[PDB]
Amino acid sequence: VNSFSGYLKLTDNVYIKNADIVEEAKKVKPTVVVNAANVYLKHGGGVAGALNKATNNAMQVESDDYIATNGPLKVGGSCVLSGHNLAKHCLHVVGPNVNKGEDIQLLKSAYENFNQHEVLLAPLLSAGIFGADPIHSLRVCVDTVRTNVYLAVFDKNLYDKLVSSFL
């Protein structure tokens, strides 16, 4: 039993809600919140910019030290950093950016990172400015993640479409 509220169950292990991941994190304070990061951990906009803003830029400061030490992440890769005031941990996951020509097949690799954590609050990956189709991303999530994932979908129209088209 966890403190997530009002989620629609999609499968044995996937739950979905029309919600802002930042507001969900502030309310629930989950063990793990997923960021839809880029390889540079430059948290400018979307999920990343909004999460970072909610940490008063502490996420960016921590991330810049991480990159200075370790270099960029791989597309499809991840790192675990602090969740600051939003969660215990933040799993920064890089999905492919289709507007950069990156391979959509790497979206499955990106979601595989979720399997290292028993429970996560997460956004849809690659489906923002990264240009991928959100229907496909949800299908990949469901077919890849085996741990318990609570998906926060920002756009109401998209949420309705994802639910009504979910197979």
Ligand X SMILES: CC1(C)C[C@@H](CO)N(c2ncnc3[nH]ccc23)C1
- Minimum CB separation of residue 39 from ligand X in Å reads 17
16 binds ligand X (CB under 6 A): no
Is residue 104 within 8 A of residue 137, CB to CB? The reply is no
Copy the structure tokens of residue 96: 């492919």
162 binds ligand X (CB under 6 A): no
Give the residue nearest to ligand X (CB). 128
Copy the structure tokens of residue 28: 């629930």
Q: Please tell me whether residue 34 adopts helix, strand or coil conformation.
A: strand
Residue 24 phi, psi (nearest 5): -60, -45
- Within 13 Å and on the Cβ side, how many CA atoms surround 18? 9
Tell which positions 96-155 bind ligand X, by CB under 6 A: 123-124, 127-128, 152, 154-155
21 binds ligand X (CB under 6 A): yes
Instruction: Report the residue number, 109 or 126, with the smaller CB distance to ligand X.
Output: 126
**Binding stretches for ligand X (CB under 6 A):** 20-22, 36, 46-47, 50, 123-124, 127-128, 152, 154-155
